[PDB]
Amino acid sequence: SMQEEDTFRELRIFLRNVTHRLAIDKRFRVFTKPVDPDEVPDYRTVIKEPMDLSSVISKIDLHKYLTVKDYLRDIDLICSNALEYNPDRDPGDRLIRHRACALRDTAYAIIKEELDEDFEQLCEEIQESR
């Protein structure tokens, strides 16, 4: 229905706003663009599904997310990829891990405060019906 297409348009507006707020935070700069194969040729042999905030923006516009739960699976993948690739005790790996945990926690905290649970349940029931 037109009403259902209005529901998914409001979902995409909400997701672009949360993603912009994460992308401008200086702590999260390393997560804003794909890893450069030149600088790190090893990356794509270890990490089987790379993800970053520029790719998330592109996915919103391609209509890849029909629920906030779908979107949070890609925020979780940005965080788990950084924990997996940088697991060591040295300061450079510990700083990336603390920033990845802060990106995940910040996205979930903005969603807990600003997403209406009945709006999410509506998106879930339209997705199920298709």
C-alpha 15/C-alpha 10 separation (Å) is: 9
Structure-determination technique:
X-ray
Cα end-to-end span (Å), the chain: 12
The neighbour count for residue 34, using CB atoms within 10 Å, is 12
Give the chain's domain count.
1
Domain residue limits at 58: 1-130
Who contacts 43 (Cβ-Cβ below 8 Å, separation ≥6)? 35, 37, 50, 85
C-alpha 76/C-alpha 68 separation (Å) is: 12
Does residue 74 sit in helix, strand or coil? helix
CB 102 within 8 A of CB 27: yes
Tokens read off for 97? 């891990």
C-alpha 85/C-alpha 42 separation (Å) is: 10
How many angstroms is the resolution? Answer: 1.4
Residue 74 burial (10 A CB sphere; 0-12, 13-18, 19+): buried
CB 103 within 8 A of CB 28: yes
CATH code of the domain in which 27 resides? 1.20.920.10
Q: What are phi and psi of 33, to 5 degrees?
A: -140, 155
C-alpha 57/C-alpha 47 separation (Å) is: 20
